[PDB]
């Protein structure tokens, strides 16, 4: 006897749904977490000047690793043991 | 999907009969034979198919060129229709244009 | 599906494992083929493993028949009276050895969905709840409305 | 006309399964089936229970008078000369008697030492229950004693299987001292008593009179039936709890559908405490000295 014209949550008339005390709790909890976040995000150990190139040694080597990893790709060695090993199918017990 | 209730007679094949035992006997004829007769000559079959290959269209058009005028009216006609169908199906249809 | 099959509660045969463990596998009978390829794995297991397996499991009898047969099978038989069939057909030696080692340590009780993980007797030690257990007693066992 | 051999042949297996379903096969001796070596079985039997038998005595143990009588029937009707070497077979009679006597002696000592408060009739009935046709038949069946027994009529009727089983015991008593056979009996017999109640195997139908007798014997005066809790008296499903009082102390209490059944139950409980068979009693010891 009460309708919600169209689709429930979409159009220019929607279902009225109210905010609840639970939802307020959750929102505030999450805020408090963020506040504490930016407090700890505020104070760097090194300055911007001090941190220049502080590892350029490692970051070159990481990339050398990433390169070598690909350089290593070739079709694998094929060995005698497999081709002749296949002959073991006909093995006779006599 | 009703299946056989009675066992068949076990088929005895002697693989040592003349045909299977002689199989592939003259195959190397050219090489071991100081090449004179080439292995194509070992082929016993339809007169337009010997030592030659092709997909369905080539088979049909080949047969029509070689043995065509010795054909019966009906198989000749069906040969013409088949050549037509295969022709426009290979040329005008497919996924890979 | 669990509504398709039967079920059993968790069980031991003859209260096994209480007094002593009695290994439940009784006889083990292989049938291989000396000539045919599908029995290849079954052959090697007979050469290398069967000796050491028999030494390790004094209780189980092991029968081994080469016969003109196309699908190598091993038939386990249990102290329970249960019989279990396997095909060792076209398997490696490590695979035969593994399978036989699975057969060795099973009860022979059927593999079917077990209803609850534990079988208890006398679960109830010190008491078992009944509706009156926690209610207070009154004077002269009088009802709620009664007069004496 | 080139068929599946795989098809027809595979269907042959189904056809056989259906034959086995509509006519159940009569049970056949494992000795008559394809894989059998009797000496290997005998040796293995002993090896898997960790017992030392002179194989002579064990072979003696599985021989029954029935097997001998049938062997003589065949020796007479086929004109075959058997008698001497067949009379040398030495049936299990002596071994079975040794077995039962020492077995009952053993159990009786076990219960006597475990539950000091049981009356003569009690240890009598318990022993009678562990040695009962049913229980021994069961345990014997599961140890593959039925399979290894030589007798006519392969289903091997219970009175046979029992003899056969105790024959093994006597045979152990010869090879190993009473100390070893003690452990065996307490392992494969006493365990059958796990979970079962006292008056389940007593069958005594007069709980009240027996309770009064035991209380008189204990110099305890007056068992008094008193009604503790009851839910619904007018319902098709009433519930009663009768307590039993000896000098204002509550000796036991029980549930029921009527006042009578409740009395009986409280009596059972009292009897259980007095005699010592209770849910709280220590589980049976297992240790190997």
DSSP result, D107-170: HHHHHHHH-TT--HHHHHHHHHHHTSHHHHHHHHHHTTHHHH-B-SSTT--HHHHHHHHHHHHH
User: D161 exposed, middle or buried (CB, 10 Å; 0-12, 13-18, 19+)?
Assistant: buried
Q: With beta carbons under 8 A apart, name residues in chain D contacting B8.
A: 3, 5, 8
Evaluated on CA atoms D229, D233, D239, D240, the torsion sign reads positive
Judge whether D278 is closer than 8 Å to chain B, CB to CB.
no
B4 in D contact zone (CB under 8 Å): yes
For chain D, the residue count is 289
B4 and D3: CB-CB below 8 Å? yes
Give the Cα separation of C107 and C21 in Å (integer): 11
Residues of C in contact with D141 (CB under 8 A): 81
Partner chains of A (3+ C-beta pairs under 8 Å):
C
Measured in angstroms, the resolution is 3.4
Write the DSSP string, chain A. Answer: ----SSSTTTSSS-------HHHHHHHHHHHHHHHHHHHHHS--SS-TTTTTTTTSHHHHHHHHHHHHHHHT--PPPP-HHHHHHGGGGG----
Q: Which strand (E) or helix (H) includes residue D83?
A: helix D83-87
Distance from CA of D18 to the nearest CA of B (A): 13
CA distance D253 to D228: 9
Spatial distance between the Cα atoms of D285 and D282, rounded to a whole number of angstroms: 8
- The Cα of A46 is separated from the nearest Cα of chain C by a number of Å equal to 59
CB within 8 Å: A92 and C40 = no
Count of C-beta atoms within a 10 Å radius of residue D183: 18
To the nearest whole angstrom, how far is the Cα of C2 from the nearest Cα of chain D? 24
CA distance D104 to D113: 14
Provide CB contacts within 8 A for D101, sequence distance 6+: none
Q: Do B3 and D7 touch (CB under 8 A)?
A: yes
Question: Chain A: nearest CA to C43, how far in angstroms?
Answer: 8
- Interface partners of C (3+ CB pairs, < 8 Å)? A, D
Q: What is the dihedral of CA B20, B24, B26, B30, to 10 degrees?
A: 180
Q: Would you call C18 and D144 a contact, using CB atoms and an 8 Å cutoff? A: no
- Selecting from C34, C37, C43 the residue whose C-beta is nearest the C-beta of A90 gives C37
Q: What is the edge-to-edge ordering of all strands in the sheet holding C73-78?
A: C61-66, C25-32, C73-78, C83-87
Secondary structure (3-state) at D89: coil
Domain ranges of chain B: 1-97
Chain C residue at shortest CA distance from A89: C37
Fold of C1-148: Glutaredoxin (3.40.30)
For residue A21, how far is the Cα from the chain centroid?
A: 34
């Amino acid at each position: 006897r009460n309708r919600i014209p169209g689709r429930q949550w979409i159009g220019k008339h929607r279902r009225p749904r109210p905010v609840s005390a639970q939802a307020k709790q959750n929102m505030i909890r999450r805020l408090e977490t963020e506040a504490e976040n930016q407090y700890w995000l505020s104070r760097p150990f090194l300055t911007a000047e001090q941190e220049r190139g502080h590892a350029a040694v490692r970051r070159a080597a990481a990339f050398q690793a990433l390169k070598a990893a690909q350089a290593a790709r070739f079709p694998a060695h094929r060995r005698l043991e497999e081709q002749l090993g296949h002959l073991l199918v006909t093995r006779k017990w006599s | 999907f009703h299946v056989r209730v009675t066992l068949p007679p076990r088929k005895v094949v002697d693989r040592w009969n003349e045909k299977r035992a002689m199989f592939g006997v003259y195959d190397n004829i050219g090489i071991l034979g100081n090449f004179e007769k080439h292995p194509k000559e070992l082929i016993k079959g339809p007169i337009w198919l010997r030592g030659w290959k092709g997909n369905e269209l080539q088979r049909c058009i080949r047969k029509k060129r070689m043995v065509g005028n010795r054909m019966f009216i009906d198989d000749l006609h069906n040969l013409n229709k088949r050549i037509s169908y295969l022709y426009k199906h290979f040329n005008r249809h497919g996924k890979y244009r | 599906t669990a509504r398709g099959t039967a079920s059993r509660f968790l069980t031991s045969v003859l209260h096994n494992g209480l007094g002593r463990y009695v290994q439940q596998l009784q006889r083990l009978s292989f049938s291989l083929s000396r000539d045919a390829p599908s029995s290849r794995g079954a052959r090697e297991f007979v050469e290398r493993e069967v000796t050491d397996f028999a030494r390790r499991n004094p209780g189980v009898v092991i029968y081994v028949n080469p016969r003109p047969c196309c699908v190598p099978r091993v038939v386990a038989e249990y102290l329970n009276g249960a019989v279990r069939e396997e095909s060792i057909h076209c398997k490696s030696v490590e695979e035969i050895a593994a399978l036989v080692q699975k057969l060795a340590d099973q009860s022979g009780l059927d593999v079917i969905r077990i209803r609850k993980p534990f079988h208890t007797d006398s679960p109830s030690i010190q008491g078992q709840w009944h509706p009156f257990t926690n209610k207070p007693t009154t004077l002269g066992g009088l009802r709620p409305r009664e007069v004496q | 006309a080139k068929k599946g051999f795989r098809a027809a042949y595979r269907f042959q297996k189904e056809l056989e399964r259906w034959r086995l379903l509509r006519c159940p096969p009569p049970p056949v001796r494992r000795s008559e089936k394809p894989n059998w070596d009797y000496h290997a079985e005998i040796q293995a039997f002993g090896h898997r229970l960790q017992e030392t038998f002179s194989l002579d005595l064990l072979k003696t143990a599985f021989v029954n008078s029935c097997y001998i009588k049938s062997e003589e029937a065949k020796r007479q009707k086929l004109g075959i000369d058997k008698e001497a070497a067949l009379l040398n077979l030495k049936d299990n009679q002596e071994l079975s008697e040794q077995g039962i006597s020492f077995s009952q002696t053993c159990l009786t000592q076990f219960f006597e030492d475990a539950f000091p408060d049981l009356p003569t009739e009690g240890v009598t009935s318990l022993v009678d229950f562990l040695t009962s046709e049913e229980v021994v038949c069961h345990v014997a069946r599961n140890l593959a004693v039925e399979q290894l027994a030589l007798s006519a009529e392969f289903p091997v009727p219970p009175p046979v299987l029992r003899q056969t089983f105790f024959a093994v015991i006597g045979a152990l008593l010869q090879s190993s001292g009473p100390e070893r056979t003690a452990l065996f009996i307490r392992d494969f017999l006493i365990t059958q008593m796990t979970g079962k109640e006292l008056f389940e195997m007593w069958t005594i139908t007069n709980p009240m009179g027996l309770l009064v007798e035991e209380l008189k014997k204990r110099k305890i005066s007056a068992p008094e039936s008193r009604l503790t809790r009851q839910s619904g008296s007018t319902t098709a499903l009433p519930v009663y709890f009768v307590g039993l009082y000896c000098d204002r102390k509550l000796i036991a209490e029980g549930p029921g559908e009527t006042v009578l059944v409740a009395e009986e139950e409280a009596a059972r409980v009292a009897l259980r405490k007095l005699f010592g068979f209770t849910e709280n009693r220590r589980p049976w010891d297992y240790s190997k000295p």
